[PDB]
C-alpha cells in the first residue's frame, strides 16, 4: 500500500513511514481512525512540509496531555455502594456506564469507552482494580472498591 | 592425512560436465595399486511396487576382456559346444553339487531349455538369493548358447535392481582409452531408456556420480 502514518502504530511504523500493509487493514481501520493517509502522488508532498513539524506535534502534545489527563483524579480510589446481595453474590453487576459515572461525576471527564475491565463486569462486592487507558502505552490503575449497601 | 586431500576436490555446488574430472580420475585418488572405475546411476523406483524392476544384460563395448567365469547348464551338443566359447565348467548337475557346497568360483549362471529343469528345481534359493537365474526377460537362456558366450565372457555388466533408486554399474580399468568410456557410460543410457516398467515417476535419472573405487567423485549430468 501507500500508507503514510499520521500516528505511532504499535508494530509497523514510526510516525511517518511508508509501510506496505494489507489493503483491508488500511480501509477499515487505519484510515478512519486517524492512523493513516493514502499517499498517492500528493500526500507524500502533503507530508513533506506541513505534517512532520506541525501535525507531528498536534498529536504529540495531546499525548503529553495523556500524561496529564490521568492525574486529574490523582486520588485513584473509588467507593461505589450500590445494591448488593446477601453475604456476597451481588444484586446487579456494575457495568462501564456506572464505572465511568463514578469517575465523570467526580474527577476525570473521560467517557464510557476508555474504561477497561480485566476481570469481567464485577459480579462481586470488594476491592477491584479498573484500568483507565488514555494512551496506547500509559495505563492507569484507578481502584474501584465495590461496596455493599 | 592421507584421506583428507580426497575430500578437498569435491565441489558439490558445481555439477561437473562430461570431459572434466573423468580425465582427472587418476588424480582424485591415492591408490597403492591399479584400480577401476564405478558408475552410480539412479532410477526412480517405488520400493513397494514390483512393476518397476529393471534387470537385463548389458553387452559392453571395448576394453576389459575375459575376466568373468561363467557357469553352464546345457545339454546335448551344447555340453561340448560352448567349450569352444571359453567357459570353464560346462555341464549339468555337477554344478549342483557345488551349489550344495557353496562355491564362489562363478558369477554367472547361463542355461538352456534343456537345462531349464535343474536350477529351477534343485538350486532354487541359492541361484536367486545371490541372483543368477535366467528366463525370457534377461538374455540368459536361449538355445543358441555358442555365439552367446563368444561375447558374454568378454563384456557384460549386469544391470540389476535395488530396493531404492540406485543402479550402480562398473567402469573399466583406469588405463584404457578414457574417451571411449564416456560412450561406455553413454551406451548404457540408450538401453536403460530403451525399455522401462511403463510406470516411471517424476525423473528418470536424478543423481549420477562416477567414482573410481573409493576416492574419485565426478558429478555426471543425466542430460549431456
Amino acid at each position: 500500500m501507500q500508507v503514510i502514518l499520521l500516528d505511532k502504530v504499535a508494530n509497523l511504523g514510526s510516525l511517518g513511514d511508508q509501510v506496505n500493509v494489507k489493503a483491508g487493514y488500511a480501509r477499515n481501520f487505519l484510515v478512519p481512525q486517524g492512523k493513516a493517509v493514502p499517499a498517492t502522488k500528493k500526500n507524500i508532498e502533503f507530508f513533506e512540509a506541513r505534517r512532520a513539524e506541525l501535525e507531528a506535534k498536534l498529536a504529540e502534545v495531546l499525548a503529553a496531555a495523556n500524561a496529564r489527563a490521568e492525574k486529574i483524579n490523582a486520588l485513584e480510589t473509588v467507593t461505589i455502594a450500590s445494591k448488593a446481595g446477601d453475604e456476597g453474590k451481588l444484586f446487579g453487576s456494575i457495568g462501564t456506564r456506572d464505572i465511568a459515572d463514578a469517575v465523570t461525576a467526580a474527577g476525570v471527564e473521560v467517557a464510557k469507552s476508555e474504561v477497561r475491565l480485566p476481570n469481567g463486569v464485577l459480579r462481586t462486592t470488594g476491592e477491584h482494580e479498573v484500568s483507565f487507558q488514555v494512551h496506547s502505552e500509559v495505563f492507569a490503575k484507578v481502584i474501584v472498591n465495590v461496596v455493599a449497601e | 592425512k592421507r584421506m583428507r586431500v580426497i575430500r578437498e576436490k569435491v565441489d558439490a555446488t558445481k555439477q561437473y560436465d562430461i570431459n572434466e574430472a573423468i580425465a582427472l580420475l587418476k588424480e582424485l585418488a591415492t591408490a597403492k595399486f591399479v584400480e577401476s572405475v564405478d558408475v552410480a546411476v539412479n532410477l526412480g523406483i517405488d520400493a513397494r511396487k514390483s512393476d518397476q524392476n529393471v534387470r537385463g544384460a548389458t553387452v559392453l563395448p571395448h576394453g576389459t576382456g575375459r575376466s568373468v567365469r561363467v557357469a553352464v547348464f546345457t545339454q546335448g551338443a551344447n555340453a561340448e559346444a560352448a567349450k569352444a566359447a571359453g567357459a570353464e565348467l560346462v555341464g549339468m548337475e555337477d554344478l549342483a553339487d557345488q551349489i550344495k557346497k557353496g562355491e564362489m568360483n562363478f558369477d554367472v549362471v547361463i542355461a538352456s531349455p534343456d537345462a531349464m529343469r535343474v536350477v529351477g528345481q534343485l538350486g532354487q534359493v541359492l541361484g536367486p538369493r545371490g541372483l543368477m537365474p535366467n528366463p525370457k526377460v534377461g538374455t540368459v537362456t536361449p538355445n543358441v548358447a555358442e555365439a552367446v558366450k563368444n561375447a558374454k565372457a568378454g563384456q557384460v555388466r549386469y544391470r540389476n535392481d535395488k530396493n531404492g533408486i540406485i543402479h550402480t554399474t562398473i567402469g573399466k580399468v583406469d588405463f584404457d582409452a578414457d574417451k571411449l568410456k564416456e560412450n561406455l557410460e553413454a551406451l548404457l543410457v540408450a538401453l536403460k531408456k530403451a525399455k522401462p516398467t511403463q510406470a516411471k515417476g517424476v525423473y528418470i535419472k536424478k543423481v549420477s556420480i562416477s567414482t573410481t573405487m573409493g576416492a574419485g567423485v565426478a558429478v555426471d549430468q543425466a542430460g549431456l
Partner: protein, 77 residues
C-alpha cells in the same frame, strides 16, 4: 438489482459448455458486497453495494472522487 454502484456491473449471460460441448444458458454474476465506506469530509459512513473490483477502484481513486461520479449519474447514495 444486482448492479455495482461504482463500476455498473450487472449480470451478463453465457453458456455452460460441458465436455461433450453441450450448451446451456447460465448467468455470470458480479462479486457484489454492500460495504460501509468512510468519508473523511462527511465524517460519516456511506453504504454502497460495490462489486469486489469496485473496491479496487476506491483503493486507487478517492472515496470522494467516486461519490462525485455517482452524483453525476443520478445515483442516490
Amino acid at each position: 438489482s444486482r448492479v455495482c454502484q461504482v463500476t455498473g456491473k450487472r449480470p451478463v449471460t453465457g453458456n455452460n459448455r460441458s465436455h461433450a460441448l453441450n450448451a446451456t444458458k447460465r448467468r455470470f454474476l458480479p462479486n457484489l458486497h454492500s460495504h460501509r465506506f468512510w468519508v473523511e469530509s462527511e465524517k460519516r459512513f456511506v453504504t454502497l453495494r460495490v462489486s469486489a473490483k469496485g473496491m479496487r477502484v476506491i483503493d486507487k481513486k478517492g472515496i470522494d472522487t467516486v461519490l462525485a461520479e455517482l452524483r453525476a449519474r443520478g445515483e442516490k447514495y
